[PDB]
């Protein structure tokens, strides 16, 4: 990713467990296929 | 597919009084007017509501031609809450019960049947639904049962007869409101098996029009049925 020089980064204007571990992975698991599938 | 433990999310359909149950499969369902029982052995959903156990019935599109129309994606369905509906050709409660569910307790369903044998089960269904009024009488003679039907907003006719247009008209003139709903189911083989389906449907939409019904829509019911359609129309007396 981008590595902006610090001098540029200074001169910016302002605007710019257990069972669940198995059931929380499987959610972030399924979401990845659907994104890759689409 | 839809097996006993499987859990589903009930969310409303575009048409008022119609609901969708999501999951691995999507089901068309209507809330049960008489919870705790099935009318033709259909499938049911029970939801815990604050807690009261509200109950919802599965609408099988193959069995019900109207439900196939919803699957077909009808733009307008006059059958809606707080509306009077005249059901012609009511063989039994297979579809009328679902129509009874859509109209709700404020509404009523005027079910018309001819053959006595299906009528007995329809009457048995009619008791369980206080809103259904069974009329075991020939639809070809609306004067026979004018005594029993008040003024109705919409007419549903699934009569599989060659003279259905005459039956629809006479009932529409006697019972249907001005600007009221007309929704018909047509099978080509009974009316005319000699000629293709498409010419038949053209002929039927023609007959509705002399009778002062403005037809709005038509839907063939594939993949659920061959050689059907549902035509939706408005009755323009004036």
């Amino acid at each position: 990713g981008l590595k902006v020089p610090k001098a540029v980064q200074k001169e910016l204007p302002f605007k710019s467990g257990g069972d669940e571990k198995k059931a929380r992975s499987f959610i972030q698991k399924v979401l990845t296929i659907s994104k890759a599938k689409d | 597919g839809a097996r006993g433990g499987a859990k589903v999310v009930i969310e409303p359909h575009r048409h008022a009084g119609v609901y969708i149950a999501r999951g691995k499969e999507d089901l068309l369902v209507t809330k049960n007017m008489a919870p705790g029982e099935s009318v033709y052995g259909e499938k049911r959903i029970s939801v815990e509501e604050p807690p009261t156990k509200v109950e919802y019935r599965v609408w099988n599109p193959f069995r019900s031609k109207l439900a196939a129309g919803i699957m077909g994606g009808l733009d307008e369905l006059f059958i809606a809450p707080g509306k009077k509906v005249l059901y012609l050709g009511a063989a039994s409660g297979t579809s009328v019960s679902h129509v009874s569910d859509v109209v709700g307790p404020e509404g009523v369903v005027y079910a018309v049947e001819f053959s006595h044998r299906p009528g007995r089960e329809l009457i048995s269904m009619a008791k369980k639904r206080p809103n259904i009024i069974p009329i075991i009488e020939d639809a070809r003679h609306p004067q026979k049962y004018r005594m029993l039907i008040g003024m109705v907003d919409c007419v549903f006719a699934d009569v599989a007869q060659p003279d259905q247009a005459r039956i629809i008209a006479l009932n529409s003139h006697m019972f249907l409101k001005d600007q009221g709903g007309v929704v018909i189911s047509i099978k080509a083989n009974c009316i005319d098996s000699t000629v293709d389906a498409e010419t038949v449907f053209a002929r039927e939409v023609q007959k509705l029009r002399e009778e002062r019904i403005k037809p709005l829509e038509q839907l063939t019911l594939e993949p659920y049925e061959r050689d059907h359609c549902i035509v939706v129309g408005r009755y323009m007396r004036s």
């Binding site: - | 009523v108 069974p134 005594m147």
Partner: protein, 384 residues
């Protein structure tokens, strides 16, 4: 040329007078059709002159039969005579063409109209309904139409409360619920009275018997030879419990409970007794109805078993419709019909399906076919 209009209401007959006649040439014009919808315009066309309510439910149906067959009832003859002038010929609007000749026969001086113009006025009356009756007591039409519905439609089919089989489904549902309740309350009675006299609980295992003994033996201290004979009469002395309870009651372990406590035990035990008494009455009830409702099915397998089969299918009409294989699995969860054993179970299932068909589709089913259809099963049983 219309003057009077005859309209039928489920509550009664109302005849109307046509004050103004709508334009006949321009009947199909937009504006005139709107006037039918508009109540204010319509009231100028017609006015209510009479209404004759039906005396009761019976009159509405027999008139409902008569209206349909194009016939004139005594009520129709009565109302019309007082209204239509004898008079060239007075003109009456009727929705039915078939009713016209009947009216003409009774009344030669009236000429009937059922043209679209007459239909137009009749449609408007139905549209507004009781709003045109201007306050006259018509109750409310909607339930009367609904009430006349199972009066009219359901008459033509010739059912009977004889046909009704819900008596069997609710009886079996109530019977099993009673069976659970009698056991639940009875077992409580053992606990309440167990504190006071526990070993009497083991002496009389039969729950129904124990409640009766507790009713007589409220206090274990009270022990007399005459009382021993009294409780000896209860059940029999073959088990010897009559002598045991006296010997036990003399040297016992149960802690005395208060008078109010004992009052609940016998009163609660009395409640248990009543439910069992009602349960046997309902059991005998279930037997009688099935012989009346399903003599073939009841005779083949039995009353209690058949009532359960009807409930599983949901109705006798249901049970008749399924194929034989479905009927066999309908009672495969409680072994109602139960390698060689399985053959008999299916064989009986085939015949049970037939008995439902005979019972369901016969207005007055008999047991002649059920009696024989059991006999072949007996021949079937002997060969295997």
């Amino acid at each position: 040329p219309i003057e009077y209009l005859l309209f039928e209401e489920p509550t009664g007959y109302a005849v109307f007078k046509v004050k103004l006649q709508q334009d006949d040439i321009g009947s199909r014009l937009k504006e005139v059709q709107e006037q039918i919808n508009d109540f204010g315009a319509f009231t100028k066309l017609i006015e209510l002159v009479s209404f004759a309510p039906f005396k009761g439910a019976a009159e509405a149906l027999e008139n409902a039969n008569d209206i349909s067959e194009g016939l004139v009832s005594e009520s129709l003859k009565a109302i019309l005579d007082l209204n239509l002038p004898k008079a060239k010929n007075i003109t009456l609007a009727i929705s039915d063409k078939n009713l016209g000749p009947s009216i003409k026969e009774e009344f030669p001086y009236v000429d009937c109209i059922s043209n679209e113009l007459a239909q137009d006025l009749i449609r408007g009356v139905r549209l507004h309904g009781e709003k045109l009756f201007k306050g006259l007591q018509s109750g409310d039409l909607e339930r009367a139409q609904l009430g006349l519905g199972h009066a009219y439609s359901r008459a033509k089919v010739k059912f009977s409360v004889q046909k009704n089989d819900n008596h069997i489904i609710q009886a079996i549902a109530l019977l099993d619920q009673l069976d659970k309740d009698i056991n639940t309350f009875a077992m409580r009675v053992k606990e309440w009275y167990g504190w006071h006299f526990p070993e009497l609980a083991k002496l009389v295992p039969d729950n129904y018997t124990f409640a009766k003994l507790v009713l007589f033996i409220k206090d274990k201290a009270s022990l007399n030879d005459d009382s021993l004979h009294d409780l000896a009469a209860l059940l029999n002395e073959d088990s010897g419990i009559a002598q045991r309870v006296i010997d036990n009651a003399r040297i016992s372990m149960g802690q005395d409970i208060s008078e109010t406590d004992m009052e609940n035990v016998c009163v609660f035990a009395q409640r248990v007794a009543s439910l069992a008494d009602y349960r046997r009455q309902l059991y005998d009830y279930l037997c009688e109805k099935m012989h009346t409702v399903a003599p073939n099915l009841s005779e083949l397998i039995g009353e209690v078993i058949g009532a359960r089969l009807i409930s599983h299918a949901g109705s006798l009409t249901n049970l008749s419709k399924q194929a034989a294989s479905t009927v066999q699995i309908l009672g495969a969860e409680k072994a109602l019909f139960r390698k060689n054993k399985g053959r008999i179970s299916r064989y009986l299932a085939n015949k049970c399906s037939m008995a439902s068909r005979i019972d369901n589709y016969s207005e007055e089913p008999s047991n002649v076919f059920g009696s024989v259809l059991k006999k072949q099963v007996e021949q079937r049983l002997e060969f295997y």
